[PDB]
Amino acid sequence: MAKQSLDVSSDRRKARKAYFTAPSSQRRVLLSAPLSKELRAQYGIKALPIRRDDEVLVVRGSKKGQEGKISSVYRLKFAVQVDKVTKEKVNGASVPINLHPSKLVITKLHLDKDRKALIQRKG
Amino acid sequence: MAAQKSFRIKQKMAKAKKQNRPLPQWIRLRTNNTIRYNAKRRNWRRTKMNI
Amino acid sequence: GVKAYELRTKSKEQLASQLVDLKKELAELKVQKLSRPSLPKIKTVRKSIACVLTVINEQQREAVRQLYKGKKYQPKDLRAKKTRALRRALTKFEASQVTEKQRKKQIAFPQRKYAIKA
């Protein structure tokens, strides 16, 4: 396809196979969620991996408009759980609802030592 | 004695019986994908533990 | 806890004492059997028991390598160097040795390489 040269990639057949099954890291590239605008200006990136201590807003779902701390990201099938972003079973216990990170935008972050150093590097 | 006494053989036939056991509930539950019918299952009258 | 870095800073006496505590502590985890639990310490103790054995093996290799640098030695260090029979076959080594001497010299001569050279 494009920048067609002697290189590794193009390639829908591979791309799907690659991104879906994913090693832990392509789930890292997947860990990235678009930043809110205040963060985009300082740090100088559109999206970076989102954190547990961070606060995140939901854009996509019915869930939209809600904010909470991110409880976990489950790496292996790439999804994020947000705190209070739950769905309810019949029994009436509430367990979290998985989110794709594309769906969310990251409102606030915890800077971190390496991650701040690399963020500065990205800038 | 008996049977079949050879120490090495005995272990293999014993080892195999445990290996042919049912699954743990959990793998169905954290789950991969699979209507999980083990398959390896080896059987009372039928089949043969292997020649 | 145990980190690899802490074990290195410890002595040959001290790590041995660790391996002794580790076996005792693993032994108590045997006793605590009736439950289930007890393990988030055994999986990690298994890793610890491996780290302490590795770190000692590594200390002995290094010490050996220092003592022997002075003398002559090396079936054991030889095995790391080749990393067997093929990479060994690729040696002796053959390369500088092969043209170590005849008829090259005549052939040529270089004021010439310099003179041109810019």
């Binding site: 396809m1 193009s10 829908r12 057949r13 | - | -």
Partner: protein
């Protein structure tokens, strides 16, 4: 096994095919017959200055197709983009797009990078023109913009 799956070309056939194809951009009725939208001219082709190699961006490229009313042809590929059926959708064929402008350049260096971004554009040099450029789908009479140095080289 085996099938060639290479057709040889006759030089004489091929030259005739290229030249007729270029010529098809000259008669307007044939361009209109192909399925080209085109007006302001349809005096045809457009010859543009040798200064067009020195077009860096895209803002100039879209703008430039506007003056000769030719931007309309750009609109035609911007929408109307067919979501193909088939196995090609697995490959990369998912969209097939319509073929609009051709810009042909004189310079040895390579095609005008800027002009390449337009939807359904193709860009070429006169040295490396082919039948396909002038007539995609073998239906002749594609809209082209020829640089003046391109025009002399065409000959």
């Amino acid at each position: 096994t085996w099938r060639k799956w290479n057709v040889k070309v006759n030089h004489n056939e091929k030259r005739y095919a290229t030249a007729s194809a270029i010529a098809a951009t000259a008669v307007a009725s044939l361009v209109l017959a192909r399925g080209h939208r085109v007006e302001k001219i349809p005096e045809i082709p457009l010859v543009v200055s040798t200064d067009l190699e020195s077009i860096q961006k895209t803002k100039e490229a879209v703008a430039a197709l506007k003056a000769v009313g030719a931007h309309s042809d750009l609109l035609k590929v911007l929408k109307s983009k067919k979501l193909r059926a088939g196995k090609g959708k697995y490959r990369n064929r998912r969209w097939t797009q319509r073929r609009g402008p051709l810009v042909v350049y004189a310079e040895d260096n390579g095609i005008v990078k800027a002009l390449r971004n337009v939807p359904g554009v193709e860009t070429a040099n006169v040295a490396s023109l082919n039948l396909l450029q002038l007539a995609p789908g073998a239906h002749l009479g594609r809209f082209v913009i020829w640089t003046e140095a391109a025009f002399t080289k065409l000959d």
